[PDB]
Amino acid sequence: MNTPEHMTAVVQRYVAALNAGDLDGIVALFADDATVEHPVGSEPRSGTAAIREFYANSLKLPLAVELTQEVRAVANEAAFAFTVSFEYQGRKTVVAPINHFRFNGAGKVVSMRALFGEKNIHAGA
Amino acid sequence: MNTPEHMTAVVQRYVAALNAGDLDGIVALFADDATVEHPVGSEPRSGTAAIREFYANSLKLPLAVELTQEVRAVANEAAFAFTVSFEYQGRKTVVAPINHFRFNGAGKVVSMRALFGEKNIHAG
Ligand SMILES: C[C@]12CCc3c(ccc4cc(O)ccc34)[C@@H]1CCC2=O
Ligand SMILES: C[C@]12CCc3c(ccc4cc(O)ccc34)[C@@H]1CCC2=O
Numbered sequence: 001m002n003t004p005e006h007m008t009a010v011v012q013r014y015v016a017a018l019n020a021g022d023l024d025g026i027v028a029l030f031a032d033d034a035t036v037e038h039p040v041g042s043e044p045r046s047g048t049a050a051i052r053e054f055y056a057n058s059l060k061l062p063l064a065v066e067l068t069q070e071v072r073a074v075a076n077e078a079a080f081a082f083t084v085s086f087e088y089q090g091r092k093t094v095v096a097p098i099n100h101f102r103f104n105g106a107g108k109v110v111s112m113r114a115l116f117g118e119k120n121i122h123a124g125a
Numbered sequence: 126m127n128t129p130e131h132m133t134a135v136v137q138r139y140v141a142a143l144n145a146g147d148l149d150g151i152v153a154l155f156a157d158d159a160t161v162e163h164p165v166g167s168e169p170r171s172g173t174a175a176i177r178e179f180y181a182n183s184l185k186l187p188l189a190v191e192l193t194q195e196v197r198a199v200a201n202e203a204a205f206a207f208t209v210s211f212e213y214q215g216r217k218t219v220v221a222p223i224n225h226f227r228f229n230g231a232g233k234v235v236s237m238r239a240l241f242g243e244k245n246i247h248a249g
Binding site: 072078080097 | 193195197198199200203204205221223225242244245
C-alpha cells in the first residue's frame with residue numbers, strides 16, 4: 001500500500017510546485033498513464049502530454065495556492081481542501097476546490113479529480 | 126443532472142440529521158441501491174437495511190457535526206470537509222474527514238465515501 005505520509009507529501013509538493021510555476025515538478029508527480037479530470041464531470045485528460053498541456057495552460061497566470069486544511073490520506077487515495085488565487089487585469093479570483101488523488105504502487109498519481117462548481121469561484125467584485 | 130443547490134442542501138440536511146440523531150432522516154437521503162464506504166478501504170455496506178444499521182451503530186454516541194468550509198458541488202457529485210466529535214468514557218475524539226457523495230437522477234445519494242486517515246483522528 002502507499003503510506004499516508006508519502007501521499008500527504010505529494011499533495012504538499014503539488015501545491016508548492018503550482019506556486020513555483022514549476023511545470024516539470026508537477027508533471028513528475030503523475031504516472032505515465034494518469035488522468036486529470038477538471039472539472040468533475042468533464043472528459044478526463046489522459047496521458048503525459050495532455051497532462052503537461054493542462055498544467056502548462058494553468059500556469060499561464062501566477063498562482064497563489066494554499067492548503068487550507070490537513071490532508072486526508074488512506075489506502076491509495078488522498079483528498080484535500082485548498083484555495084487557488086489569481087489576478088487578471090486587476091481582477092481577483094479565489095477558487096476553493098476539493099481535489100482527489102489516487103496513487104499507484106510506485107507512489108505516482110494515476111488520477112486527479114478537481115471537484116468545484118460556480119459557487120466555489122469567488123470574485124473580488 | 127442534479128442542481129448544485131440541491132446537492133448542497135442535501136449535505137446540509139445530512140449534517141443536520143447527524144446532529145439531531147435523526148436516523149430516519151439520514152436514511153431518507155439515500156437511494157434504495159446506495160452504498161456507504163467508511164473508511165475508504167472497508168467493504169461497502171449496501172442497500173437501505175445495511176445503511177440504516179451503519180448509521181444506527183454510529184449514532185450509539187451523540188455526534189457533534191459541522192461543515193468546516195463551503196460544500197463543493199458539481200456535475201452529479203459533492204464533496205465536503207467537516208469534523209465529527211463524540212465523548213465516551215471521559216475522552217473527546219474529533220475526526221476530520223472529507224466525504225464524497227454521488228447523486229442519482231432522482232436527487233438521492235447513491236454513493237457515500239468517507240476519506241480520513243489516522244492523522245485525521247484527534248484525541249483531545
Ligand atoms: C485592456 C483591454 C480592454 C479591457 C480588457 C483587456 C484584456 C483583458 C481584460 C480583462 C478584464 O477582466 C477586464 C477588461 C479587460 C484588453 C486588452 C487590450 C485593451 O484595450
Ligand atoms: C462516518 C461519518 C464520518 C466519519 C466518522 C463518523 C462517526 C464516527 C466516527 C468514528 C471514528 O473513529 C472515525 C470516523 C467517524 C461520521 C458518521 C457519519 C459520517 O459521515
